[PDB]
Protein backbone atom coordinates (compact mmCIF):
# COMPACT_ATOMS: atom_id res chain seq x y z
CA UNK A 1 0.00 0.00 0.00
CA UNK A 2 2.82 2.49 0.82
CA UNK A 3 5.02 1.47 -2.10
CA UNK A 4 4.01 2.35 -5.65
CA UNK A 5 1.93 -0.35 -7.29
CA UNK A 6 3.29 -2.41 -10.18
CA UNK A 7 2.75 -1.39 -13.80
CA UNK A 8 0.73 -3.94 -15.84
CA UNK A 9 0.79 -5.19 -19.46
CA UNK A 10 -2.21 -5.74 -21.79
CA UNK A 11 -2.72 -9.19 -20.30
CA UNK A 12 -3.03 -7.82 -16.80
CA UNK A 13 0.38 -9.18 -15.68
CA UNK A 14 3.06 -7.16 -13.85
CA UNK A 15 5.97 -5.66 -15.84
CA UNK A 16 9.34 -7.30 -15.28
CA UNK A 17 12.88 -5.91 -15.72
CA UNK A 18 13.86 -9.17 -17.43
CA UNK A 19 11.26 -9.08 -20.20
CA UNK A 20 10.52 -7.02 -23.33
CA UNK A 21 7.43 -4.94 -24.19
CA UNK A 22 6.05 -3.04 -27.18
CA UNK A 23 5.03 0.50 -26.28
CA UNK A 24 1.73 0.67 -28.14
CA UNK A 25 -0.71 3.57 -28.54
CA UNK A 26 -3.87 3.11 -26.38
CA UNK A 27 -5.81 4.44 -29.37
CA UNK A 28 -4.50 2.62 -32.50
CA UNK A 29 -6.19 5.19 -34.77
CA UNK A 30 -3.35 7.45 -33.61
CA UNK A 31 -0.50 5.18 -34.72
CA UNK A 32 1.46 2.15 -33.67
CA UNK A 33 4.28 1.31 -31.33
CA UNK A 34 7.54 3.20 -30.89
CA UNK A 35 10.70 2.72 -32.92
CA UNK A 36 13.98 4.40 -33.99
CA UNK A 37 14.44 6.75 -36.94
CA UNK A 38 16.80 9.56 -38.06
CA UNK A 39 15.46 13.07 -38.48
CA UNK A 40 15.99 16.76 -39.24
CA UNK A 41 18.92 16.29 -41.61
CA UNK A 42 20.62 14.12 -38.98
CA UNK A 43 21.80 10.57 -39.74
CA UNK A 44 22.76 9.76 -36.14
CA UNK A 45 21.89 9.23 -33.44
CA UNK A 46 18.45 7.80 -34.21
CA UNK A 47 15.43 9.56 -32.65
CA UNK A 48 12.78 7.68 -30.70
CA UNK A 49 9.74 7.95 -32.98
CA UNK A 50 6.19 6.58 -33.38
CA UNK A 51 5.30 4.29 -36.30
CA UNK A 52 2.25 5.93 -38.03
CA UNK A 53 0.71 2.55 -38.84
CA UNK A 54 -1.74 1.43 -36.16
CA UNK A 55 -1.18 -2.21 -37.16
CA UNK A 56 2.59 -2.11 -36.33
CA UNK A 57 3.88 -2.93 -32.84
CA UNK A 58 7.18 -1.02 -33.36
CA UNK A 59 10.34 -2.19 -31.53
CA UNK A 60 10.32 -3.77 -28.04
CA UNK A 61 12.00 -2.02 -25.07
CA UNK A 62 13.69 -3.34 -21.91
CA UNK A 63 12.99 -1.38 -18.68
CA UNK A 64 15.45 -1.28 -15.76
CA UNK A 65 14.92 0.41 -12.36
CA UNK A 66 17.29 3.38 -11.94
CA UNK A 67 18.43 2.62 -8.38
CA UNK A 68 19.02 -0.79 -6.81
CA UNK A 69 17.48 -3.75 -8.62
CA UNK A 70 14.54 -5.02 -6.53
CA UNK A 71 14.52 -8.72 -5.68
CA UNK A 72 11.14 -9.01 -7.41
CA UNK A 73 12.33 -7.29 -10.60
CA UNK A 74 8.91 -5.60 -10.86
CA UNK A 75 8.47 -2.29 -12.69
CA UNK A 76 6.50 0.17 -10.59
CA UNK A 77 4.75 3.49 -11.14
CA UNK A 78 6.32 6.78 -10.03
CA UNK A 79 9.76 5.11 -9.95
CA UNK A 80 12.84 6.25 -11.92
CA UNK A 81 13.76 3.74 -14.64
CA UNK A 82 15.94 3.44 -17.71
CA UNK A 83 14.49 2.49 -21.10
CA UNK A 84 16.31 1.03 -24.12
CA UNK A 85 15.19 -0.59 -27.36
CA UNK A 86 15.99 -4.27 -27.90
CA UNK A 87 16.52 -3.81 -31.63
CA UNK A 88 19.28 -3.26 -34.20
CA UNK A 89 20.53 0.25 -34.77
CA UNK A 90 22.11 1.51 -38.01
CA UNK A 91 24.08 4.00 -35.89
CA UNK A 92 25.62 0.94 -34.20
CA UNK A 93 25.63 2.42 -30.66
CA UNK A 94 23.61 2.61 -27.41
CA UNK A 95 19.84 2.10 -27.82
CA UNK A 96 19.09 3.49 -24.35
CA UNK A 97 16.81 6.57 -24.26
CA UNK A 98 17.87 10.01 -22.96
CA UNK A 99 16.27 13.45 -23.26
CA UNK A 100 18.04 15.68 -25.79
CA UNK A 101 19.82 18.46 -23.88
CA UNK A 102 19.66 20.57 -27.05
CA UNK A 103 16.68 22.26 -28.71
CA UNK A 104 16.73 20.94 -32.31
CA UNK A 105 14.01 22.43 -34.53
CA UNK A 106 12.91 24.29 -31.41
CA UNK A 107 11.92 21.06 -29.64
CA UNK A 108 13.34 18.76 -26.94
CA UNK A 109 13.48 15.22 -28.37
CA UNK A 110 13.97 11.81 -26.80
CA UNK A 111 17.03 10.27 -28.47
CA UNK A 112 19.35 7.30 -28.23
CA UNK A 113 23.15 6.88 -28.56
CA UNK A 114 25.93 8.57 -26.51
CA UNK A 115 25.14 11.57 -24.32
CA UNK A 116 26.83 14.37 -26.31
CA UNK A 117 25.86 17.24 -23.98
CA UNK A 118 26.02 15.76 -20.46
CA UNK A 119 24.73 17.40 -17.29
CA UNK A 120 26.22 17.59 -13.76
CA UNK A 121 23.80 14.86 -12.64
CA UNK A 122 23.94 12.27 -15.41
CA UNK A 123 20.13 11.88 -15.21
CA UNK A 124 19.24 12.78 -18.83
CA UNK A 125 18.26 9.07 -19.09
CA UNK A 126 15.81 9.03 -16.20
CA UNK A 127 12.11 8.39 -16.95
CA UNK A 128 8.95 7.42 -15.08
CA UNK A 129 5.75 5.58 -15.95
CA UNK A 130 2.65 7.24 -14.44
CA UNK A 131 -1.12 7.16 -14.15
CA UNK A 132 -3.34 10.24 -14.78
CA UNK A 133 -6.83 11.53 -13.92
CA UNK A 134 -9.49 9.46 -15.66
CA UNK A 135 -7.08 6.82 -16.90
CA UNK A 136 -8.41 3.42 -17.99
CA UNK A 137 -6.95 0.23 -16.55
CA UNK A 138 -3.69 -0.80 -18.28
CA UNK A 139 -3.22 2.71 -19.72
CA UNK A 140 -0.30 5.03 -18.81
CA UNK A 141 1.74 8.12 -19.73
CA UNK A 142 5.53 8.45 -19.73
CA UNK A 143 7.58 11.25 -18.16
CA UNK A 144 11.15 12.57 -18.27
CA UNK A 145 12.26 12.76 -14.64
CA UNK A 146 16.02 13.43 -14.56
CA UNK A 147 16.75 17.12 -14.03
CA UNK A 148 13.05 18.03 -14.47
CA UNK A 149 9.56 16.45 -14.67
CA UNK A 150 7.92 16.75 -18.08
CA UNK A 151 5.28 14.61 -19.92
CA UNK A 152 6.32 12.89 -23.12
CA UNK A 153 4.14 13.43 -26.19
CA UNK A 154 4.49 12.90 -29.94
CA UNK A 155 5.37 15.56 -32.52
CA UNK A 156 3.41 14.78 -35.69
CA UNK A 157 3.64 16.76 -38.91
CA UNK A 158 0.47 15.54 -40.70
CA UNK A 159 1.96 16.90 -43.94
CA UNK A 160 4.15 13.81 -44.24
CA UNK A 161 7.15 13.12 -42.02
CA UNK A 162 8.48 11.02 -39.16
CA UNK A 163 6.67 11.44 -35.81
CA UNK A 164 9.04 11.99 -32.91
CA UNK A 165 8.60 11.38 -29.20
CA UNK A 166 9.62 14.42 -27.13
CA UNK A 167 8.68 16.94 -24.43
CA UNK A 168 5.27 18.35 -25.29
CA UNK A 169 1.56 18.32 -24.58
CA UNK A 170 -0.71 16.52 -24.72
CA UNK A 171 1.02 13.40 -23.39
CA UNK A 172 0.85 10.11 -25.34
CA UNK A 173 -1.31 7.45 -23.71
CA UNK A 174 0.35 4.04 -24.02
CA UNK A 175 -0.25 0.36 -23.10
CA UNK A 176 2.52 -2.27 -22.71
CA UNK A 177 2.22 -5.45 -24.79
CA UNK A 178 4.43 -8.33 -23.68
CA UNK A 179 6.84 -9.14 -26.54
CA UNK A 180 7.95 -12.71 -27.45
CA UNK A 181 11.39 -13.52 -25.96
Amino acid sequence: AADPPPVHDTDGHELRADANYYVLSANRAHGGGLTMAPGHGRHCPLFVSQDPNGQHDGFPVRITPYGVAPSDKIIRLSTDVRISFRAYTTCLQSTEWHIDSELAAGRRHVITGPVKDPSPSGRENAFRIEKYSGAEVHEYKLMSSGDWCQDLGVFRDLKGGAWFLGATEPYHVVVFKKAPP
Binding site: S119, P120, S121, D147, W148, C149, Q150, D151, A167, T168, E169
Partner: peptide
Protein backbone atom coordinates in the same frame (compact mmCIF):
# COMPACT_ATOMS: atom_id res chain seq x y z
CA UNK B 1 5.25 22.64 -18.85
CA UNK B 2 8.32 21.36 -16.99
CA UNK B 3 9.13 21.61 -13.26
CA UNK B 4 10.99 23.26 -11.81
CA UNK B 5 10.94 26.34 -14.07
CA UNK B 6 12.31 29.72 -12.96
CA UNK B 7 10.87 32.80 -14.62
CA UNK B 8 12.51 36.27 -14.65
CA UNK B 9 10.07 39.13 -14.97
CA UNK B 10 10.11 42.91 -14.73
CA UNK B 11 7.42 45.45 -15.62
CA UNK B 12 5.11 42.69 -16.82
CA UNK B 13 7.42 41.22 -19.45
CA UNK B 14 9.52 38.05 -19.11
CA UNK B 15 13.24 38.70 -19.45
CA UNK B 16 14.53 35.11 -19.30
CA UNK B 17 13.82 31.63 -17.86
CA UNK B 18 15.73 28.63 -16.51
CA UNK B 19 14.24 25.17 -17.05
CA UNK B 20 15.24 22.40 -14.68
CA UNK B 21 17.33 21.78 -11.60
CA UNK B 22 20.33 23.49 -13.30
CA UNK B 23 21.79 25.13 -10.15
Amino acid sequence: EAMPTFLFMKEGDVKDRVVGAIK
